[PDB]
Each structure stands twice: as structure tokens, then as C-alpha cells.
Design a protein around this nucleic acid. Structure first.
Lengths: 291, 346
DNA sequence: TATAATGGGAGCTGTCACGGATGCA
DNA sequence: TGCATCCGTGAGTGCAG
């Protein structure tokens, strides 16, 4: 565009403020793409919603915040020796034993059952008075034969194994200790996995954590007007955003940082100028800064 | 072409907020002010002087003008200068320069977003001395007030709180610039009182009321006299170019004499006096026709009582008051021959 | 100062002729 | 390039009014 040229208002907003277009989604319907996501024209962003330009989509208002909280603990399982595969760990989905015929996994203490079911798989915890006695781990293929809140003595069947049994996919086998005795081995696996707890964000509140951020106990996820109805992070986990109000498909260029930023929000800038971090990160394009 | 459909169109571009974007922008504006005096007591400069600098850099150098009230002239050198001992702070202190900047940016989108609301209020204050747009702009003017005073935490929509400052600001303009003769906003307020109460009186009586029928229903401290002189200051002037006749070859102003400047009769009548009285000082004595020519003025007047009379006349204080009598005396006999003075008393 | 309120409203008519500046096959 | 076509500018005097 040359000196002494007549631009309409929109034209001037493009050249001076840049293209961007926000799209609403049917309330509840989730995001076929997700936050931070670079995308381009005609690309499906939700069942009925598709973008008509290029750029870096951004989430507006997540109504559903899910925290995958992290667990690392110790659980055991006894199996026939001629039916388990030897490995010192079990990547998720990884087959760890196969049983010729069904074999019943029996108790090795007495107490009340604390059943803890997972997407695929299950935990079983026994306890005489409210101290724990044992933590058994049912993999995939072992079908529990108890209910939560239930009494078992030594040696009655808890689960039944049938055929192949494999690790679940959310769950890891960090280290695996085995010990033979009789015609069985009893693994104490150092399992690792995470659990979903879905939080609801309300119109007068604002999630204050990015996508995939790490938090400890205490850390604040959502804020609100009154200190109640805030969501604090129960303990260690990391965050996820589903169900935004709608998503803004900007045409910009993102540049993460690690330390103090040298440019504030509002600044005009060209390529090559020093954005943040002592001069490492720098501008690709001509454009308009948004810290 | 039509300067209202024009503005009705620019407005129709900024989308209306939704409940989250409402509370988002409002929230950011609140926090940004907090940020600004946290940002003030760290560096110790001044909240406002600091606020204008946030303001400049967000809107662009497009606008900057030495803001009345700030102590230094806010020229683009002091905005780089001061934006410097700003970005000079630790990431946990210069944390708030990003907060302010975000605030000012949300200030705007929240004003710009809610202009269609002002329109829908000024629309019904028409025909009151101010034009639609004039009313809109005033309306807007108040809207700005509404954001710097909003409290998103009270949970009310924005519409609700602003519909107060908006009409508060129309109504102050309708009442401060409408009349060619500006009358304090409170006198304007009581005037409208007479109007509205007179109207009901008429709707009650079947005829317009008298002065006293107003002073009664207007209550105590109100007499007929005081309703009357209130109405005559209520009185709006009229155009010198008002049309006289159904043609247009005479102006109401053309039938209005110019009382101020002297007429040629008067102009001449003055010059013949102020010398045929100089034609009665140099007739008997010109130093007694000079000390009483300085007991008043040939031009400017010189007359007090006893004080400069006592300074430089040559003579003592109550001796000039005696040749004051004889200077006058001589003129009262002097002016029984040159009797050409009586006419000048009209 | 706090429910909520979010794009206007009235056109005016029955002259004419010339000269200039602009749009269009 | 030549010619519709629109926009802007004029349209008597004085006196009573």
C-alpha cells in the first residue's frame, strides 16, 4: 500500500490491528482442536464449527476444567509362575501374563474391601481397622469378585483371571519386584497413573492456569468473587481445558519465554526485535505484541 | 452522507459482549488500576502520571497531549523516558506494567462495546436544546465514567450500572449548554418545576393558572412576586434575524435602534456644552476657574472631599473650599448675563 | 451511584435556464 | 473523444411590513 491511498475502516483495522475471528460453539459440544493450536482455513474446530482463516486458535472460557492428578504407589498380585511374562517393567497396554485357564486371585490378609475402579483396570485395598493391610492390583483381564465395603478372610477369591491380562493404558509399571514360592510368583509393582476430577468453571470465574500446567497442593486453578467456589489444586497434577465458550482464531505468531520479558503488551514491533529472555527470543513478523 | 446513520454503522461493528467477556474486561480494568498504584508505591512516581503513560503506549503515539492536572508536559520523550524506569523493574515488580497495559486495553473494548446502549438512551432526550449526536457524545462521556467506577464483584450486568451515569450526563448537558444565557443547573431545575406544576394546574382548572395559583401549589416561600421574576429570567432570547413578513426582505433586527452610540444631536450637544462652560471659566478668573476646574474634570473628573484638595492647590485646605464657593458664586452671577446655560438642563 | 436495559427518524414534492465538472458507450 | 447528467447559482426597484 502506497503513500496517499484510501483504505476503508476494515482495511485499516486489518493492516493496523490484524485479522482475527471468534467462533461460538453449541454450549457443551467440545473442541475438535484444543488451545494453543495452530490451524488454517476450512479446518474443523467443532462438530458444527469450522474456521475460515489461518492462525493460532485460543480458548475463551473453559466451562469444564479437568485435573489429571498424579499417583505413584505400590501394589501386589500373585499369579501362576508358568503364565506371567518376565519383565522388570510394564509400559501401558503391555501384556504381563497369560493364563491357560481361569485362576482365582485369593486374599492374603483378612479385612474390609476398599474397591477403587479405573477406566480399565481396578485397585483393591484391604484394611482391618482403618489402617491398611494390603493393596492388590487387578490388571485388565482380572474381573473383581467383591464389592466395596466387603469382608474377606484369608484365602477367599477376590478376582478371576481369564486368558491374556495386560496393563491398562493410563497406568505404568515403574519397577517390578517378583518373588517365587510354591508354583506362583507374587509381584509388588511400583505402579504409576493419574485420575480425572472434572471441575466446573462459572461465568463469573476465570481459570488462571494454562493448558498442561504443573501444580502442587495449594496451587490455584480457578478464581471467583467469594473465596469459596474457588478451585484449589488438591495435590500434584496437571491441567486440561475442555468445553470453551467459543474459540478465537487469531492470525498471530506465538513465542514462549523462560524469564523476564522485555516488551510489554501494546508495543508495535518488526522482525528481529528482542522480545524477552536477554535477547534469545525475537520477532518473526511485523506485528502487535500481546504478553 | 447522513452523519447519524454513519455513527449508527461504526457502532454496529464492535460486537456486543457476552456475560463472560463482560466480566473479563471489567475484571481486567479493576486489577489494572490496583496494578497502577502498586506500580506507584514501588517506584513512587504518581498514580495518574503513571496511568497516562500506560495510556499512551497502548493507544499508540497517535495520541499524547500534556494532560491538565499532571505536573510535567507529557511529550513522547517523557513517555519513553518514563516507560524506561518502568520496564527496569524485577519480573515480580515489572509484573504489574503488564497488568496496567492489559487494563487500559480492556477499558477500550468495554467502552467501544457498549455504545449502542448510549444511543438507546439519548434517543429519548431529543428536542430539548441539544441535537441527537451532541446528546450521544454527552451520553458516551458519562459511559466513560461508568467503567472507571464499575465493580464487577457486585455481580450486576454492565447495562444496569452505566444507565445511571449515562442519563446523569445527558441531563447535565441539556441543562448547561442549551440556553444562550447559561443559568445554574439548579435554577434550571426549579424552573422546570414551575412548568410541570403549572401544567397539572391547567389540566385541573380548564385554564392556565395565575401567578398566585402557582405560588400556592408551589408551596411555602413561594409568593406571586417570586413566581413572576423567576419566569422572566427563565426567558429565552430571540433572533435578530427573525423573519418580519411572509416575504424575506426584512429582519426583526432592522427595526431596532442603536441606543448606545451617541446620536449626532447629542454628539454636537456635548461639544457645545463642554466649551461654552470653558466660555464661563476664562470670563472672570482662570486660576479660580482652575482650582474648581480641578474640583471636578474637564476630562476624567477630579473630586474627592478634603485630601488632595489639601495637597497641591497652592492654598490651604478650607481656603480652596471658599474660592470654591466664590468661583461658583461668580459663575451664578456670571450666568445671569451669558444665560446660555439653562437650555442644557433639558 | 448498582434488577435490566445495547443501531434514528422524518423525508415533501407544480420553476428554470446556464455554466461548469464528472461519468460512460 | 464526444455527450448525457448532476450540482450549484441566479432570478427588478422603492414603500407599507
Amino acid at each position: 500500500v502506497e503513500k496517499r491511498q484510501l483504505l476503508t475502516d476494515e482495511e485499516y483495522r486489518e493492516l493496523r490491528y490484524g485479522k482475527q475471528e471468534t467462533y461460538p460453539l453449541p454450549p457443551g459440544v467440545d473442541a475438535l482442536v484444543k488451545d494453543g493450536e495452530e490451524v488454517v482455513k476450512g479446518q474443523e474446530l467443532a462438530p458444527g464449527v469450522v474456521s475460515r482463516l489461518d492462525g493460532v486458535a485460543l480458548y475463551r472460557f473453559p466451562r469444564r476444567v479437568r485435573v489429571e492428578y498424579v499417583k505413584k504407589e505400590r501394589a501386589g498380585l500373585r499369579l501362576p509362575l508358568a503364565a506371567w511374562v518376565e519383565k522388570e517393567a510394564y509400559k501401558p497396554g503391555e501384556i504381563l501374563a497369560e493364563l491357560p485357564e481361569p485362576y482365582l486371585f485369593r486374599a492374603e490378609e483378612e479385612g474390609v474391601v476398599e474397591l477403587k475402579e479405573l477406566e480399565e483396570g481396578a485397585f483393591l485395598v484391604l484394611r482391618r481397622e482403618d489402617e491398611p493391610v494390603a493393596t492388590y492390583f487387578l490388571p485388565v483381564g482380572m474381573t473383581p469378585l467383591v464389592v466395596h465395603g466387603e469382608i474377606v478372610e484369608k484365602g477367599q477369591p477376590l478376582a478371576e483371571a481369564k486368558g491374556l491380562l495386560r496393563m491398562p493404558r493410563q497406568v505404568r509399571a515403574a519397577q517390578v519386584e517378583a518373588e517365587e514360592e510354591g508354583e506362583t510368583v507374587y509381584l509388588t509393582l511400583f505402579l504409576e497413573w493419574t485420575e480425572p476430577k472434572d471441575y466446573r468453571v462459572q461465568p463469573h470465574m476465570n481459570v488462571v492456569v494454562p493448558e498442561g500446567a504443573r501444580v502442587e497442593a495449594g496451587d490455584k486453578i480457578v478464581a471467583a468473587i467469594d473465596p469459596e467456589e474457588e478451585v484449589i489444586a488438591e495435590a500434584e497434577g496437571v491441567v486440561h481445558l475442555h468445553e470453551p465458550a467459543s474459540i478465537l482464531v487469531v492470525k498471530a505468531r506465538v513465542y514462549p519465554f523462560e524469564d523476564d520479558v522485555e516488551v510489554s503488551t501494546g508495543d508495535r514491533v518488526a522482525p528481529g526485535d528482542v522480545l524477552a529472555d536477554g535477547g534469545k527470543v525475537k520477532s518473526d513478523v511485523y506485528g502487535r505484541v500481546e504478553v | 452522507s447522513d452523519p447519524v446513520r454513519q455513527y449508527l454503522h461504526e457502532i454496529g461493528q464492535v460486537p456486543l459482549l457476552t456475560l463472560e467477556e463482560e466480566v473479563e474486561l471489567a475484571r481486567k480494568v479493576e486489577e489494572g488500576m490496583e496494578a497502577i498504584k502498586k506500580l506507584s508505591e514501588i517506584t513512587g512516581l504518581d498514580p495518574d502520571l503513571i496511568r497516562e503513560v500506560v495510556r499512551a503506549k497502548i493507544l499508540g503515539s497517535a495520541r499524547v497531549r500534556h494532560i491538565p492536572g499532571l505536573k510535567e508536559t507529557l511529550d513522547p520523550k517523557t513517555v519513553e523516558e518514563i516507560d524506561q524506569k518502568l520496564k527496569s523493574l524485577p519480573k515480580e515488580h515489572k509484573r504489574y506494567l503488564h497488568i496496567a497495559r492489559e487494563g487500559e486495553a480492556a477499558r477500550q473494548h468495554l467502552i467501544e462495546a457498549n455504545l449502542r446502549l448510549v444511543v438507546s438512551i439519548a434517543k429519548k432526550y431529543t428536542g430539548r436544546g441539544l441535537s441527537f449526536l451532541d446528546l450521544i457524545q454527552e451520553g458516551n462521556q458519562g459511559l466513560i465514567r461508568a467503567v472507571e467506577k464499575f465493580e464487577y464483584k457486585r455481580r450486576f450486568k454492565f447495562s444496569t450500572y452505566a444507565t445511571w451515569w449515562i442519563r446523569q450526563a445527558i441531563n447535565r448537558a441539556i441543562a448547561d449548554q442549551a440556553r444562550t444565557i447559561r443559568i445554574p443547573v439548579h435554577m434550571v431545575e426549579t424552573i422546570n418545576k414551575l412548568s410541570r406544576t403549572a401544567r397539572q394546574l391547567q389540566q385541573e382548572l380548564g385554564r392556565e393558572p395565575t401567578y398566585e395559583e402557582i405560588a400556592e401549589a408551589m408551596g411555602p416561600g413561594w409568593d406571586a412576586k417570586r413566581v413572576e421574576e423567576t419566569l422572566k429570567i427563565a426567558q429565552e432570547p430571540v433572533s435578530l434575524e427573525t423573519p418580519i413578513g411572509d416575504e424575506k426582505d426584512s429582519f426583526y433586527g432592522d427595526f431596532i435602534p442603536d441606543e448606545h452610540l451617541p446620536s449626532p444631536v447629542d454628539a454636537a450637544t456635548q461639544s457645545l456644552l463642554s466649551e461654552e462652560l470653558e466660555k464661563a471659566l476664562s470670563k472672570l478668573s482662570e486660576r479660580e476657574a482652575m482650582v474648581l476646574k480641578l474640583r471636578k474634570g474637564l476630562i476624567d473628573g477630579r473630586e474627592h472631599t478634603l485630601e488632595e484638595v489639601g495637597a497641591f492647590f497652592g492654598v490651604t485646605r478650607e481656603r480652596i473650599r471658599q474660592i470654591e464657593n466664590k468661583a461658583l458664586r461668580k459663575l451664578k452671577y456670571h450666568e445671569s448675563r451669558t444665560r446660555k446655560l439653562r437650555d442644557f438642563l433639558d
